[PDB]
């Protein structure tokens, strides 16, 4: 075919995996594909250099980059480790001049990055900073002032330096293009007058997730200005209980006919929750993670949500609330039950294994679970696995490390074995409770589609990790803390590591000597020892490192390691 014809065929091919196969059919396709590829997804920012991406794919309009590993969320990655996006922005600034979208996760993003984005990318439309840190409201002010075509500013779970809420006032009066605004992580109060005018002049606004600083008494005002909203994150959800205030909120929310997703609810007062009831016949997503209201209050809401597909809730729901959920929400796909008091040992709520069993039995489309509880049985896990062979993500956190089945006192090996045995398309698993090498044997035998596994306080010996690396065909990320896994399984399965995004091991048994030898053996891996005790050389080769992070890369050793990171 003529090159224009082939470029046009490829315009209908947008999945990364398909673009990649295309680039490998012949030399001609390689060149044509690279020159009209529209988006790149870089799941590990250090797996490749900016120059390499920009040279290969010159016409990119959308970039997604991910930095720090998942365990950074749990304070296991010391500050300064890395993840700086500036070199990427700098490199793109002179090349990707038609650039439209930047989506970043766990990166360090500075005001200099944000200023360079504003001034470099005239067509800039989408900024998502997901669990990012290193910038302030001043950087946001630069985006607001300058990005005249901006459609999405989404700051989900980011840590922002809250210098001043004045940044939002920088959107000029001629700006009208906003579609999605998520400021839920911002501690500083924006000018409410500026927010009200912004919402009023942006008729394509579909998603508005506010910060806690917008008080419940002002919510109706904004909702009246945005009746087309599909997603709403409330601000503060507390006020003096008054008839006129409740009625105003009720009327405003009932005028929002397209609302499918509701979240926020900080400081929620039970007296004001019924105001959302009109909305909850059509709701598909409800996030009640921050509402500390009790089971019965949650049930009255949930009874009104027959179309619910995704629920995030505190363990205040309790077993009785989950039993009601199981009866009501037949389209439920995803349930996340978060701990109300994660740092207390004795239970503060009646949420046990029984709630998860109830939903597994009652919700035929339930395929994603994240569940925090204090007790579990093998019988429960076996019932779950048998009821829900369609499960694709199963994340179970028993609060006390190494807690056995509370009825039999046995490890939870057979229970998690049943999950991997019965749930053939399980892509994600996290384990907890008392676990021996046997569970890892089951995982290696049965979990052939598992891509991500998270493990803590589990196993007996290197045989455990060996079973996983040897048997888990689809494995992409393995992240382990505080397990008796060490040199033997790691080096015995070194080649497996070239088939994965990364392996994280902290507080395990891996010696500095094994890290050095692995680095020697596998020059296309970056084997990073992350250790705050000073030079690993200053200790015997046999001494375990605090952490090791290993990832395949085409770029070679990183140029930005802090003093406490060493590449082998």
């Amino acid at each position: 075919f003529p090159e224009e014809v082939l470029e046009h065929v490829f315009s209908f091919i947008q999945l990364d995996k398909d673009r990649n196969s295309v680039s490998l059919v012949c030399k001609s396709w390689y060149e044509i594909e690279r020159w009209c590829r529209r988006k790149v997804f870089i799941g590990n920012c250090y797996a490749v250099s900016p120059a390499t991406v920009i040279r290969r794919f010159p016409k990119v309009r959308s970039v997604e980059l991910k930095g720090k590993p998942h365990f950074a969320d749990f304070n296991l990655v010391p500050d300064g480790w890395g993840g700086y996006v500036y070199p990427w922005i700098e490199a793109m600034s002179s090349s990707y001049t038609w650039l439209e979208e930047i989506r970043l996760k766990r990166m360090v993003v500075t005001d200099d990055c944000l200023e360079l984005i504003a001034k470099s990318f005239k067509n800039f439309k989408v900024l998502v900073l997901s669990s990012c840190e290193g910038f302030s409201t001043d950087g946001l002010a630069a985006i607001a002032a300058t990005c005249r075509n901006l459609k999405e500013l989404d700051l989900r779970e980011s840590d922002v330096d809250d210098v001043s809420g004045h940044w939002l006032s920088h959107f000029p009066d001629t700006y009208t293009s906003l579609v999605s605004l998520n400021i839920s992580c911002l501690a500083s109060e924006v000018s409410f007058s500026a927010l009200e005018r912004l919402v009023t002049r942006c008729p394509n606004l579909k998603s508005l997730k506010l910060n806690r600083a917008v008080p419940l008494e002002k919510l109706a005002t904004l909702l009246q200005r945005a009746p087309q909203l599909e997603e709403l994150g409330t601000g503060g959800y507390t006020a003096e209980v008054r008839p006129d205030v409740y009625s105003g909120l009720s009327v405003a929310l009932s005028g929002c006919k397209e609302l499918r997703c509701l979240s926020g609810f900080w400081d929620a007062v039970p007296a004001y929750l019924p105001a959302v009831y009109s909305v909850c016949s059509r709701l598909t997503t409800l996030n009640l993670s921050y509402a500390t209201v009790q089971s019965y209050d949650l049930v009255k809401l949930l009874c009104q949500c027959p179309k619910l597909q995704r629920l995030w809730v505190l363990d205040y729901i309790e077993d009785a609330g989950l039993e009601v959920l199981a009866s009501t929400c037949k389209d439920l796909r995803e349930l996340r039950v978060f701990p109300s008091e994660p740092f207390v040992m004795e239970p503060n709520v009646a949420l046990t294994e029984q709630g998860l069993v109830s939903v597994s039995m009652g919700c035929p489309k339930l395929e994603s679970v994240l569940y925090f509880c204090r007790q579990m049985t093998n019988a429960a896990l076996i019932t779950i696995a048998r009821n829900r062979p369609n499960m694709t993500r199963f994340r179970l956190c028993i609060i006390e490390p190494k807690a056995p089945d509370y009825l039999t006192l046995e490890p939870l090996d057979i229970g998690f074995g049943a999950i991997v045995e019965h749930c053939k398309d399980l892509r994600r698993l996290s384990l907890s409770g008392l676990l021996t090498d046997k569970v890892f044997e089951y995982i290696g035998t049965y979990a052939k589609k598992m891509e991500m596994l998270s493990v803590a306080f589990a196993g007996d010996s290197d045989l455990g990790m060996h079973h996983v690396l040897s048997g888990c065909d689809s494995l992409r990320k393995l992240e382990i803390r505080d397990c008796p896994f060490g040199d033997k399984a790691l080096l015995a399965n070194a080649s497996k590591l070239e088939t994965m995004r990364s392996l994280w091991m902290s507080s395990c048994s891996v010696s500095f000597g094994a890290c050095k030898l692995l680095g020697q053996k596998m020059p296309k891996l970056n084997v990073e020892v992350i250790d705050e005790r000073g030079a690993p050389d200053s200790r015997p080769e046999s001494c375990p490192v605090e952490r090791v992070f290993i990832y395949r890369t085409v770029a070679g050793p990183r140029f930005d390691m802090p003093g406490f990171v060493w590449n082998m």
Binding site: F71, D73, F74, N75, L76, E157, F338, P339, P342, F343, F372, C397, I399, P401, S454, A456, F457, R481, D482
Partner: peptide, 13 residues
């Protein structure tokens, strides 16, 4: 007590 356990983003209080 254990660092980063349970695996949540909550402040300790």
């Amino acid at each position: 007590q254990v660092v980063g356990w349970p695996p949540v983003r909550n402040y300790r209080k």
